């Protein structure tokens, strides 16, 4: 039916979209990739109810899904481990010797 809505009305739902545009337009005008994850598909059932305050914070499961999306976003930018140690072989493949110095 067209008379039903999935998201209850809130006074601040408009500025949140307005700020979302501010963040979105900031990404397109910067240098690096700034798109962390999508959270617009989460409903009030994904929030923990607090008496006298409401439902403002994510669930432990829902926030877990957000972190997983963040991991995928970073891995797309960096597909491989960028760091490498000076040593490559196991401890059994290197001698331990002393020297008077480099020269």
């Amino acid at each position: 039916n067209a008379a039903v809505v999935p998201m209850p009305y809130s006074p601040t739902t408009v500025p949140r979209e307005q700020i979302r545009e501010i963040q979105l337009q900031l990404i397109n005008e910067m240098t690096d990739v700034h798109m962390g994850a999508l959270t617009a598909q989460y409903m009030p059932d994904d929030f923990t109810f607090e008496p006298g305050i409401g439902q403002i914070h994510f669930n432990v499961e829902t926030s877990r899904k957000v972190c997983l999306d963040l991991a995928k976003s970073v891995l797309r930018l960096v597909p491989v481990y960028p760091l490498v140690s000076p040593v490559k072989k196991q401890h059994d493949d290197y001698w331990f010797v002393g020297r008077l110095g480099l020269d």
Binding site: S85, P86, V87, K88, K89, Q90, H91, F96
Partner: protein, 240 residues
Amino acid sequence: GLILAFRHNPDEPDKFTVTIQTPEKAYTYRLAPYGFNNKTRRWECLDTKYGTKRTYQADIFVATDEDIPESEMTEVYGTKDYIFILDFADLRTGVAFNGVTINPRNITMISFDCTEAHHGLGKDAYIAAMYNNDDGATFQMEIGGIHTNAALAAGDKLQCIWRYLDVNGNAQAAENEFEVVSYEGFGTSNFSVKCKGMLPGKFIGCDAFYGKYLQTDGPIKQVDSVKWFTNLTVSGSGRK
């Protein structure tokens, strides 16, 4: 009846320790840094979480010789002006001063543990998470921030302070030591160490870790440094 105060510049001031050789064993005592609170005109331990919770008067320390240069002294808790106080009447062992109290009536030597920053696993070593293995004889430990040249071996002892969630749902904090059995990932700065013992709850976070006195030897970039012991002030009711 004696109290000793002085100034020193260790690489790990929060982890500075002194060993006391009683005719029974070799106890270890930790010297937490002390800062002079100006408003109350008393010396107070900078470590507010696991400190001695003891206060001393300004008379306990007197400066007469040349002070340690600032550039040669490390900064801890946002302060470089700190002194170490050794009281023989409060010789509580343990990392968080929860160990057995040393009897000061029979002491054979007082050895200071001066060591380099990269000693053992390194200064930047930290614990990621802890969980018990399905096997009923050991548990796993994850350690990161380890310098490349470091190596590990079975039988090593590690001191750690960590907080865990009790089975009743309330947070708890405890300290103890662990014994290393095996590890994987040499030279990648990340170790997967398997250790004996049991964990009394789910791991939450780690507050302290030492990882010192490793059986395996390793090279390090050669560097020369000067250790300073300035203004050794001794006072108390005992014979001086």
